[PDB]
């Protein structure tokens with residue numbers, strides 16, 4: 141146990157580590173905003189064309205598509221005035237591997253089939269509506285309804301997409317199918333969508349964050365600081381793409397053996413390193429690799445590992461969450477037996493410690509990110525204590541039994557001059573795309 145706890149201790153980050161990360165994130169943000177350094181910035185600070193504007197939208201029905209993982213969502217969002225009301229209906233769709241690792245057209249054809257299914261099941265296929273698209277990958281926006289995919293993240297691979305107008309890809313697929321018509325009026329990031337949906341509930345919400353399969357944030361920047369887009373008046377949402385923080389070496393002093401290994405076998409070696417420390421795509425696999433380290437030292441399972449624990453990806457991140465949901469070891473035993481293992485009573489405690497060590501580092505790394513954003517915003521204003529609302533969506537955050545609590549407390553220590561309200565978005569990644577579309581249509 142002695143030696144377990146010092147192998148596990150490599151995952152600790154001191155206050156001083158977290159402040160260093162925070163400040164470096166603030167300097168990368170700043171690099172990404174300036175024309176002189178934008179092109180070489182690891183933290184891209186992408187203009188979204190979502191602006192501060194008087195409250196209100198068109199009234200009516202709006203479709204939303206939300207693509208950001210293997211599971212995706214179609215939504216019908218009805219905006220009405222009394223005063224305002226928003227009601228939603230959704231369906232979920234799972235994308236087969238074939239459709240994610242083939243061509244862009246195969247991917248967008250599958251998407252359009254699903255839209256078709258949604259419209260059938262809501263007896264509205266004869267209707268032509270405005271559609272907002274939540275598309276959760278790095279995009280260079282040229283307008284609210286136009287954007288070029290820079291690169292796939294989170295293991296997506298469809299060919300023929302990178303470098304192309306993602307909105308064009310959707311619209312072409314819709315037309316190929318010829319079974320329905322929609323006006324694609326807006327495409328946004330999931331961070332952005334989450335923030336808009338949250339703003340609707342709370343006007344102080346000016347940051348969106350995702351801690352899901354990937355990890356990213358967006359926030360409202362002053363237009364004079366957004367040098368890529370002409371104008372000094374008002375604010376525009378910037379999609380930080382903070383996932384790529386570290387991709388210029390900024391994190392090198394913190395990366396562990398397990399981190400290099402996750403990166404090397406990932407779909408995108410050398411990219412999204414910050415996100416690899418945090419996102420649900422990778423947390424379960426980090427844990428897996430730590431559990432193997434403790435085995436090949438004969439500190440775990442008497443040094444015998446199962447077939448499935450030697451198998452990349454078999455420690456799914458939902459396991460990490462379930463482990464930590466356990467004190468009778470029932471939750472831990474039920475995940476471990478699943479894996480072809482026979483834990484002692486001590487192993488169960490060891491696996492729960494390992495989960496904790498990875499999941500805690502994630503919450504801590506993530507808090508430094510968000511603190512960076514929130515402190516920068518405070519500094520750009522007339523704030524003694526800044527009260528701000530953050531919209532947060534993602535499965536790590538919503539479902540991980542203690543990640544959230546750990547994240548909040550770490551965030552608060554790094555932001556001792558702000559009071560932060562975190563709003564857990566029920567379906568903001570999807571609803572927000574509809575609401576942005578409604579605002580866009582009001583033109």
Ligand SMILES: Cc1ccc(NC(=O)[C@H](COC(C)C)Oc2ncnc3c2cnn3-c2ncccc2Cl)nc1
Pocket residue numbers: 189190191192193194195196197219224284335336337339340345346360575576578579580
């Ligand atoms: C092209 C375009 C479209 C939209 C926007 N801006 C917005 O959608 C703004 C962004 O504001 C940030 C600070 C979050 O958000 C909104 N701008 C205007 N009205 C809005 C909202 C959000 N809800 N909401 C709203 N409020 C009341 C009823 C219905 C709605 Cl949709 N900018 C450009």
Ligand SMILES: OC[C@H]1O[C@H](O)[C@H](O)[C@@H](O)[C@@H]1O
Pocket residue numbers: 208275276277278293294329330331350352353354355356357381383415
């Ligand atoms: O889904 C959360 C995030 O995952 C990845 O970081 C994507 O690059 C990013 O665009 C998205 O916001």
Ligand code: NA
Pocket residue numbers: 363364365366367368369370371372
């Ligand atoms: Na500007």
